[PDB]
């Protein structure tokens, strides 16, 4: 979605 959707996925993998 933004930029954090790479390593420290803030929302990408919020769950796991």
Coordinates of N, CA, C and O in Angstrom, one line a residue:
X1 N 0.8 -1.2 0.0 CA 0.0 0.0 0.0 C 0.9 1.3 0.0 O 0.6 2.2 -0.8
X2 N 1.8 1.3 0.9 CA 2.7 2.4 1.0 C 4.2 2.0 0.8 O 4.6 1.6 -0.3
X3 N 5.0 2.1 1.8 CA 6.4 1.8 1.7 C 6.8 0.7 2.8 O 7.7 -0.1 2.5
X4 N 6.1 0.7 3.9 CA 6.3 -0.2 4.9 C 5.9 -1.6 4.6 O 6.1 -2.6 5.3
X5 N 5.2 -1.7 3.4 CA 4.7 -3.0 3.0 C 5.8 -3.8 2.4 O 5.6 -4.6 1.4
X6 N 7.0 -3.7 2.9 CA 8.2 -4.5 2.4 C 8.8 -5.4 3.5 O 8.5 -6.6 3.6
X7 N 9.6 -4.7 4.4 CA 10.2 -5.5 5.5 C 9.3 -5.5 6.7 O 8.7 -6.5 7.0
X8 N 9.3 -4.4 7.4 CA 8.5 -4.2 8.7 C 7.0 -4.1 8.3 O 6.4 -3.1 8.8
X9 N 6.5 -5.0 7.5 CA 5.1 -4.9 7.1 C 4.2 -4.5 8.2 O 3.9 -5.3 9.1
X10 N 3.8 -3.2 8.3 CA 2.9 -2.7 9.3 C 1.5 -3.3 9.2 O 0.8 -3.5 10.3
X11 N 1.0 -3.5 8.0 CA -0.3 -4.0 7.8 C -0.3 -5.2 6.9 O -1.1 -6.2 7.1
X12 N 0.6 -5.3 6.0 CA 0.8 -6.4 5.1 C 0.6 -7.7 5.8 O -0.3 -8.5 5.5
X13 N 1.4 -7.9 6.9 CA 1.3 -9.1 7.7 C 1.0 -8.9 9.1 O 1.5 -9.5 10.0
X14 N 0.2 -7.8 9.4 CA -0.2 -7.5 10.7 C -0.4 -8.7 11.6 O -0.1 -8.8 12.8
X15 N -1.1 -9.7 11.0 CA -1.4 -10.9 11.7 C -0.2 -11.9 11.8 O 0.3 -12.1 12.8
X16 N 0.2 -12.4 10.6 CA 1.3 -13.3 10.6 C 1.4 -14.0 9.3 O 1.5 -15.3 9.2

